[PDB]
């Protein structure tokens, strides 16, 4: 069984969390979308897109997640020899913090970088031994009155 | 930025698996394996928030098309604090499907830090320990007989 | 759990036919066939409900397939104090659809309550006269090709 | 018809209590009780269904509200030849939620006819032996602040 | 691009008009006027379609904020060769509704060519005089008292 | 009462289906968009990923469309001195056509780019005197076995 949490009588305060995680890349694959030459689109502004979307989706997403009255969303990259890092903020005025929704935002907007680098990352034989997402964590959760 | 055109491809069988781990205390594992997580079924809930992210894949990655997704299996592996989710989506389409199983395994795994944050955070309400890491594709296969 | 394996069955037409019943004061039941219901058109918004439910039953039932349903068809029939629906859903497919054609009717029924809950509260505005009974699959047909 | 207009209205506790039955196999509903449905673990899927409904109802009815739910109960009662579902919603807000508890259960419903479909089908592949019933609102509650 | 903060503000009535035309052949108007399209209740489809749209724009556009609506209404006019849709969107809430009414419009018309297109349509299956139109913001308003 | 059609015994045929529909525009606002220097972000970018998504989600937002196995979306756009037209062709190879979804990918995007340029477009009373979408058309509708 499961048991979601009730959430009703706590006080509506000011809640935000920021969550970052990266994508392991080639690095002649960073160095293309750096440039913004990547066939298939915009990199960054796709993974934005699907990150803000994502958040606002995490309730459909996490089954006990409760719907919530997001107040903001940014979404924000840097760029490391090998690797792009994702960071997701995510703001609201609620009864329950938004750390759940931030990690969401981050892990949707590298799952978008990956597919619109599908093509140029993996290798000869169609595989994928130099990509992958990792250190997707919580950077701080705050909650004040 | 475009969605791909893949119909004037053959339809064959496809298959892709993707893991990912969760970083967790050890007493977080422990009361998962014996059930004393207050939130809930740990397990059961990752894998149906897996599957049912992976039929949302299409809504989430941009570009990823609406595939006829014949089949999920969504499995764990447990550590001594950690916890690793194993994603094996299949299709018999014209688009291979390791978005679809990055999306599963992904989702899964947000679900499993979701069900259990009340253990995993520390007194200032933060979450220093937990983390989601390397999650790839193992494989991916594409069979005409 | 995990979504069952259909890939390799045949492609067959496959039709199934759910039925269900709303218990109505028959003075509501009344007010539908005249169409007196403030709210609106509550058969119309039924059938629209449960259409559009039908092809949601893969996101809102977690181990659903998805299914490239090709017609749906809601029907009623008025009682003295109720009013029965059925819901017929027709596909080419590798598995049936009576769990489609259940959620169909079944959100049907509940559009129809939420039109005509105004009229059916009592007044403590509690609903002991309103009730969804015997919601079941008339026939389940799949062709052995 | 029209989203009725709630503005106005205070913000006030809202809770309602829905509960239905699925009739089954004595067999299958012991199989449920010891866990040996090879589908999977049927009540935890159930529950995860239900809450995940309950939150999608806005756009499953029509006319229903956006919602801010603050909490979701999903219980079961175990009969000789059925399986009893018990929804309960809360929020604080300017309409109550008993067709979100409605929407609830009946998807809670729906999931458990879905995981035990295999055990509940005869000879001849159809279910009438299978049958939701007596869906209704236990209570409605709706403070008068 | 980011989802601009709007924590910050004040709760206010939020109340936006938007108006748009689709335009028909004069016999499709009066086929409609009388009932007499095949596919069904033109009107009422189009009302639910437009209300569940304006649930729905989050999820449409990108950098649209989650908004607890209060309220829809939509309506027609009708034109010799034309109909017109307004959809009113309410909210008591931190931004204004006006791509709310926008999206509540457009899809109302969306829906009023799809249960039309096979009267529209001309002898080679093309659309030569169908055409949605004008679509505009009529007023966007915001009350504190 | 509605009535969705049946497509099931139609052949699978390559379908093709482009629709054009314009925003109209300050100058400036066009000049500014084209420069890329609005403030709230990648306007053409954004319009471009909400449009695609759009077209996936037509059956959820149009009652009667059927889901359909989209195998590519391509957005492009068009300046002029006061307006931005947009062009969106969708493919498959099934069995009902797909013109529904190239009018809704069309009006997304466009609904997507007011709402990225509201803050440029509005006038010193906040309201919207010079934006409106127009002209919104189906280009051609291919149907070829």
Known sequence: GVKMVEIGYKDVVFRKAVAK???????????????????????????????????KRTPELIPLCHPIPITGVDITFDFGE????????????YKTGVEMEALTGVTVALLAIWDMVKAVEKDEKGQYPYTRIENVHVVEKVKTH
Chains 1, 6 share one sequence.
Do not use: F, H, S
């Open 21 to 55: 995680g990266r994508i392991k890349l080639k690095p002649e694959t960073v160095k293309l979308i750096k440039e913004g030459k990547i066939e298939k689109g915009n990199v960054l502004a796709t993974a934005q897109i699907a990150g803000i979307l994502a958040v």
């Open 82 to 93: 090998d690797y792009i890092e994702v960071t997701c903020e995510v703001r609201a005025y």
